[PDB]
Amino acid sequence: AKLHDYYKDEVVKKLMTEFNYNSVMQVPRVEKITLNMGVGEAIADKKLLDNAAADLAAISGQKPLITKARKSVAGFKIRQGYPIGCKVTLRGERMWEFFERLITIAVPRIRDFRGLSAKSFDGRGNYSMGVREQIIFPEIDYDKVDRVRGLDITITTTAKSDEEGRALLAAFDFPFR
Amino acid sequence: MKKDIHPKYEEITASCSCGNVMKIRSTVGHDLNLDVCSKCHPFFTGKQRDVATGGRVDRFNKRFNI
Amino acid sequence: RSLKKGPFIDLHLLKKVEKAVESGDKKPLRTWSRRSTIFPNMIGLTIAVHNGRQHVPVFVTDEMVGHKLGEFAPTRTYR
Amino acid sequence: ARIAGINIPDHKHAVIALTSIYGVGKTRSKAILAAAGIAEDVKISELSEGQIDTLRDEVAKFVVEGDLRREISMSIKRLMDLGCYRGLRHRRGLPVRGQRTKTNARTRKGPRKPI
RNA sequence: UCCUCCUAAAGAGUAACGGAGGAGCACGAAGGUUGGCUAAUCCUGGUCGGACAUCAGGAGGUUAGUGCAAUGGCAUAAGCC
RNA sequence: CCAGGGCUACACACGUGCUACAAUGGCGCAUACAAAGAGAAGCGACCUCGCGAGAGCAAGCGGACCUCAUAAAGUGCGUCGUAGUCCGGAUUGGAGUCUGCAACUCGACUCCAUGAAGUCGGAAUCGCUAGUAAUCGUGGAUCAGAAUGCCACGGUGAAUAC
RNA sequence: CGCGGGGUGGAGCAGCCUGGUAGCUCGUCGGGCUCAUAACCCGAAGAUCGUCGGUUCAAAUCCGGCCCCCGCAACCA
Numbered sequence: 192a193k194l195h196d197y198y199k200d201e202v203v204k205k206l207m208t209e210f211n212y213n214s215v216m217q218v219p220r221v222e223k224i225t226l227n228m229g230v231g232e233a234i235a236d237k238k239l240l241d242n243a244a245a246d247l248a249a250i251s252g253q254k255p256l257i258t259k260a261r262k263s264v265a266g267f268k269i270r271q272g273y274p275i276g277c278k279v280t281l282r283g284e285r286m287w288e289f290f291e292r293l294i295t296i297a298v299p300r301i302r303d304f305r306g307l308s309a310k311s312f313d314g315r316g317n318y319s320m321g322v323r324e325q326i327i328f329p330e331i332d333y334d335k336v337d338r339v340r341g342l343d344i345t346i347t348t349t350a351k352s353d354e355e356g357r358a359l360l361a362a363f364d365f366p367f368r
Numbered sequence: 369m370k371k372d373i374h375p376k377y378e379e380i381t382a383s384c385s386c387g388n389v390m391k392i393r394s395t396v397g398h399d400l401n402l403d404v405c406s407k408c409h410p411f412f413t414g415k416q417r418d419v420a421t422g423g424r425v426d427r428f429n430k431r432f433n434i
Numbered sequence: 435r436s437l438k439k440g441p442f443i444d445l446h447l448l449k450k451v452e453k454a455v456e457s458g459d460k461k462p463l464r465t466w467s468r469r470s471t472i473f474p475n476m477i478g479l480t481i482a483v484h485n486g487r488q489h490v491p492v493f494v495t496d497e498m499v500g501h502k503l504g505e506f507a508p509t510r511t512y513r
Numbered sequence: 514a515r516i517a518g519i520n521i522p523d524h525k526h527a528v529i530a531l532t533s534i535y536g537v538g539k540t541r542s543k544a545i546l547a548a549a550g551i552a553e554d555v556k557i558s559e560l561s562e563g564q565i566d567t568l569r570d571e572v573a574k575f576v577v578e579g580d581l582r583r584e585i586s587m588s589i590k591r592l593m594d595l596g597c598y599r600g601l602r603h604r605r606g607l608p609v610r611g612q613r614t615k616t617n618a619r620t621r622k623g624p625r626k627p628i
Numbered sequence: 629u630c631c632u633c634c635u636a637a638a639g640a641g642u643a644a645c646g647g648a649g650g651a652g653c654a655c656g657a658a659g660g661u662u663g664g665c666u667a668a669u670c671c672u673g674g675u676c677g678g679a680c681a682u683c684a685g686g687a688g689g690u691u692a693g694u695g696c697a698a699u700g701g702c703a704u705a706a707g708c709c
Numbered sequence: 710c711c712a713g714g715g716c717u718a719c720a721c722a723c724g725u726g727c728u729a730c731a732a733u734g735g736c737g738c739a740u741a742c743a744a745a746g747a748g749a750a751g752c753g754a755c756c757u758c759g760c761g762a763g764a765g766c767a768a769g770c771g772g773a774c775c776u777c778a779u780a781a782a783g784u785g786c787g788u789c790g791u792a793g794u795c796c797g798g799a800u801u802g803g804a805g806u807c808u809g810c811a812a813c814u815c816g817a818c819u820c821c822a823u824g825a826a827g828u829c830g831g832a833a834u835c836g837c838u839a840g841u842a843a844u845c846g847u848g849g850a851u852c853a854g855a856a857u858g859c860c861a862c863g864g865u866g867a868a869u870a871c
Numbered sequence: 872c873g874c875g876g877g878g879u880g881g882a883g884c885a886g887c888c889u890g891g892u893a894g895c896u897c898g899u900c901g902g903g904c905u906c907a908u909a910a911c912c913c914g915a916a917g918a919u920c921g922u923c924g925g926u927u928c929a930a931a932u933c934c935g936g937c938c939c940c941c942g943c944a945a946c947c948a
């Protein structure tokens with residue numbers, strides 16, 4: 192909520208002076224944060240997915256989608272339409288609420304932290320983080336989980352390049368290397 | 369959002385040991401207690417203290433001193 | 435490691451370094467003193483340490499100081 | 514029970530609670546609790562939350578966890594780059610402190626192999 | 629015995645112990661209809677996770693798919709929900 | 710005769726040890742009891758510094774007197790509550806100490822952090838008939854330095870032998 | 872040339888004509904027992920399945936060629 196109001200007032204005005212944008216809409220805005228959790232090991236144990244679903248449902252506000260396998264492959268021993276991973280495509284109000292909660296308190300709680308990767312862009316301003324543990328978020332109780340599982344955060348923007356997209360995230364006091 | 373299916377997304381107060389009080393909204397419960405935040409974490413000083421560790425010649429000179 | 439009362443180098447090597455350093459960079463120094471330590475003044479020299487049957491050239495760098503010369507010369511060959 | 518990088522023990526004495534921290538042992542933990550002004554017989558389950566904050570600043574003085582692991586990794590990786598006797602010993606996977614390598618050395622060398 | 633292509637000479641038909649492949653079913657949803665949807669395969673970033681499981685964006689655009697061989701056909705989608 | 714290097718190599722195999730795998734115990738303060746030695750370019754108090762190896766100044770003794778020398782098990786109060794653990798203490802990094810012209814190949818010990826295998830061992834198989842086995846110290850010889858070996862010493866102290 | 876059948880640790884056989892993780896018996900290797908060798912006892916490794924290709928999500932197993940091996944036919948004048 193607050194970071195959205197901060198973005199509208201403080202950030203845009205900062206970003207306009209950098210690349211001398213003609214219009215206010217030209218500034219890159221954060222479209223959606225997609226929290227993904229390819230549990231994978233759900234082939235053997237079916238409940239292990241439903242455990243991950245509860246952990247994503249705890250981490251994010253909303254309940255996750257159970258993504259099916261797109262195509263059958265023998266390397267992992269999976270078939271067409273088999274539930275292999277969990278996902279959340281959170282956007283809008285709860286997105287800005289989660290984005291605060293990620294960068295302000297969770298990212299600090301990473302074990303052996305130093306500085307997040309600057310090179311990690313797709314060549315179109317869309318960022319992604321790979322958190323190893325679930326414990327870094329304060330939602331999960333310590334004596335509840337019993338697996339070293341994690342998720343990946345995926346920040347989608349309206350930017351046309353990583354050089355342009357880095358500034359947007361950098362304006363939120365985001366930690367880079 | 370679809371009502372019923374989601375968990376209870378309630379407002380809560382984060383209060384770290386540093387002093388930075390901060391209200392947020394999440395599926396935790398009543399209250400929070402934190403160790404570090406975006407402020408007060410050693411990354412701005414961490415990189416300064418980490419990178420400047422090496423130095424072998426002075427370590428020899430500290431023993432001999434002549 | 436041993437010795438607080440001054441890091442140890444053989445007289446003949448200390449002289450040979452001091453004579454080589456003041457003159458300039460020339461060639462590898464034929465030295466049998468492995469036992470001796472490495473000083474800061476030795477940096478730049480490509481001194482040749484006796485491995486057992488032959489001399490092994492060692493270009494002395496910023497890090498090669500606290501360590502002795504015999505460490506940069508494997509005696510027993512394996513495979 | 515959340516100081517330093519990890520430290521989350523429960524039903525354990527405060528001295529031995531801090532042994533689980535990487536970079537702190539039996540003797541160092543007595544020095545932490547002596548400086549903080551905390552009894553060693555108590556546990557973190559029975560102790561106050563404001564009194565845990567005193568332990569956080571005390572362990573910050575010493576080098577611990579991710580600071581220490583890399584300081585060890587740096588010193589080991591340094592030796593290998595120099596190409597010294599210990600540096601060869603490290604990357605080869607054989608014992609360093611002039612130990613016997615013929616009969617034993619199984620800890621460093623790893624378990625038994627065929628011929 | 630039945631289906632598909634060529635042989636078959638620009639309608640149909642057309643033989644040979646000529647050339648290549650399939651069928652003796654399947655399904656109460658894989659039918660109906662309504663209302664939606666768009667693929668392959670790569671590129672780059674990202675926890676375990678690696679070429680490839682799941683995610684994001686970009687590239688290509690039907691190389692895809694069509695319960696089953698081949699032929700002809702399908703975005704108005706006959707494709708997938 | 711001399712400088713270094715080697716006897717300390719290491720895909721492996723075995724011998725003989727030691728330390729383990731714990732709760733009949735491990736960690737903590739705190740208490741009582743030995744014997745046999747040894748010392749003269751030796752053994753070296755008490756002091757003062759040392760986190761500790763040790764460092765200076767030096768007391769006495771060729772010794773029933775002086776010193777290395779607080780024996781440890783064992784008790785008595787805690788605290789841990791069966792974990793790869795406050796078990797094990799390997800291995801690595803750093804910082805050191807003495808000896809010695811010199812400690813990297815290739816020493817010993819100390820401190821700090823580190824915390825490997827191992828949860829009583831396959832076929833087999835060894836020693837032991839009472840102060841014996843078992844377990845905890847201690848000393849000496851060679852020895853500048855370098856024992857888990859060797860040679861001695863004494864603690865608590867069994868079962869079983871139809 | 873025609874129609875069956877094969878080709879799997881070093882050896883001989885299962886698993887192969889019903890597609891998903893390769894056994895058995897000897898032999899080799901390590902350790903025991905023995906004065907030593909054998910026998911005996913206890914552990915251990917060792918085959919991507921003739922080869923080259925298809926289909927398949929995946930082939931020792933389905934289908935096609937080629938390469939060997941083995942059986943049966945190769946007749947009436």
Ligand SMILES: [Mg+2]
Binds near residue numbers: 610
């Ligand atoms: Mg040692």
Ligand SMILES: [Mg+2]
Binds near residue numbers: 611612
């Ligand atoms: Mg040795």
Ligand SMILES: [Mg+2]
């Ligand atoms: Mg040794």
Ligand SMILES: [Mg+2]
Binds near residue numbers: 625
């Ligand atoms: Mg073994």
Ligand SMILES: [Mg+2]
């Ligand atoms: Mg007919």
Ligand SMILES: [Mg+2]
Binds near residue numbers: 636
């Ligand atoms: Mg025609």
Ligand SMILES: [Mg+2]
Binds near residue numbers: 637
């Ligand atoms: Mg015609």
Ligand SMILES: [Mg+2]
């Ligand atoms: Mg026609």
Ligand SMILES: [Mg+2]
Binds near residue numbers: 643
């Ligand atoms: Mg006709």
Ligand SMILES: [Mg+2]
């Ligand atoms: Mg047919």
Ligand SMILES: [Mg+2]
Binds near residue numbers: 658
């Ligand atoms: Mg249909």
Ligand SMILES: [Mg+2]
């Ligand atoms: Mg329709």
Ligand SMILES: [Mg+2]
């Ligand atoms: Mg097609």
Ligand SMILES: [Mg+2]
């Ligand atoms: Mg078709």
Ligand SMILES: [Mg+2]
């Ligand atoms: Mg129709």
Ligand SMILES: [Mg+2]
């Ligand atoms: Mg239909």
